[PDB]
Amino acid sequence: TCPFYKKIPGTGFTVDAFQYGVVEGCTAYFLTHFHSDHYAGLSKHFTFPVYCSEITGNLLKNKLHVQEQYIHPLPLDTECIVNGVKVVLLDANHCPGAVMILFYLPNGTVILHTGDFRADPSMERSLLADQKVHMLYLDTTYCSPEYTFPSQQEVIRFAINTAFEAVTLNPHALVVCGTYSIGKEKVFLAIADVLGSKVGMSQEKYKTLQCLNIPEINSLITTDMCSSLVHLLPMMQINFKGLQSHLKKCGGKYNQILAFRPTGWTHSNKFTRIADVIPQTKGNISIYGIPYSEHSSYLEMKRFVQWLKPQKIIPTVNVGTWKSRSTMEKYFREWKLEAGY
Numbered sequence: 001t002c003p004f005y006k007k008i009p010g011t012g013f014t015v016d017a018f019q020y021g022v023v024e025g026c027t028a029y030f031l032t033h034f035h036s037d038h039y040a041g042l043s044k045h046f047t048f049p050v051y052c053s054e055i056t057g058n059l060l061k062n063k064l065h066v067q068e069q070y071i072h073p074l075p076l077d078t079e080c081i082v083n084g085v086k087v088v089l090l091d092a093n094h095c096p097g098a099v100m101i102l103f104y105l106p107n108g109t110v111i112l113h114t115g116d117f118r119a120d121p122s123m124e125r126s127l128l129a130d131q132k133v134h135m136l137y138l139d140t141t142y143c144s145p146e147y148t149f150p151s152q153q154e155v156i157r158f159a160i161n162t163a164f165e166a167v168t169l170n171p172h173a174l175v176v177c178g179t180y181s182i183g184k185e186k187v188f189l190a191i192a193d194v195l196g197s198k199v200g201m202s203q204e205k206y207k208t209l210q211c212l213n214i215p216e217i218n219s220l221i222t223t224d225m226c227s228s229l230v231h232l233l234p235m236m237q238i239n240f241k242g243l244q245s246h247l248k249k250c251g252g253k254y255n256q257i258l259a260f261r262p263t264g265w266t267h268s269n270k271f272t273r274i275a276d277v278i279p280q281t282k283g284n285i286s287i288y289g290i291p292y293s294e295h296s297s298y299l300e301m302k303r304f305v306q307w308l309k310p311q312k313i314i315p316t317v318n319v320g321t322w323k324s325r326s327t328m329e330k331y332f333r334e335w336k337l338e339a340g341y
């Protein structure tokens with residue numbers, strides 16, 4: 001059964017609600033982004049209207065085989081009418097194709113559903129500038145002040161400088177980057193650009209990347225592993241055993257691996273600056289954990305909400321424990337008292 005924080009009242013609509021069977025009263029299913037916890041339940045046998053971005057609809061058709069007649073892609077930043085209700089899709093600064101959804105209810109209530117997002121001051125000059133929001137359905141993944149991490153630009157600067165130094169010292173070093181979903185593509189793209197290489201990967205990952213509307217992508221990626229010195233591997237293989245095994249397969253072309261595991265937040269963030277980050281090393285293999293986040297930090301979240309001034313907040317993450325719920329409610333009231341709304 002579909003939980004209340006996935007339903008939009010006063011409409012026939014649900015958000016990220018594909019794992020509950022036929023939801024009673026649902027006339028249109030929205031999908032914010034192509035991450036498995038959110039698309040869980042979709043497949044080629046789905047026969048209700050799915051509303052999403054262009055990029056998400058490429059992934060639904062090619063990767064999950066959803067039939068074309070049920071995929072309804074909407075342009076971003078554009079007022080659209082869906083089953084009698086005005087909606088807008090906005091860029092969520094999450095993974096490729098990820099959106100927030102503005103719903104203009106027939107009674108005059110305005111609802112923002114963030115999906116998954118990384119809040120940014122640039123959102124203060126989107127179509128959100130123009131009107132009041134009554135209800136906020138909020139990605140609360142990192143809603144506690146201990147969750148700090150650097151800008152994506154600082155993290156990419158560290159990765160590029162680290163990879164370029166290693167491979168210039170040793171032209172026979174291979175770089176490997178872990179992946180298990182879409183998102184975080186700038187990590188491997190930026191490193192391959194500084195090294196003058198295409199990125200090598202499996203046919204299944206190449207397929208996925210070809211759905212993302214990335215400019216000049218044919219110039220940037222390949223399935224010919226032998227021609228490339230930056231390889232993508234599943235995240236599960238980013239350990240000493242998996243990497244050893246991979247280096248054997250390369251036929252003595254390489255004699256060292258430098259590997260990156262983009263994580264979200266980890267508790268080594270509480271003590272170390274990005275500049276000071278060191279790898280785990282065994283023999284000729286080194287593994288860096290890098291805190292590349294596609295969700296808001298505590299401070300980015302708090303700024304966005306204090307700017308938007310919603311009348312009510314409904315969290316969409318960390319909703320399963322009383323302690324998490326009570327913590328989030330306390331911070332919402334602090335923010336409201338500090339800012340005066």
Ligand code: NI
Nearest residue numbers: 033035094116
């Ligand atoms: Ni996500």
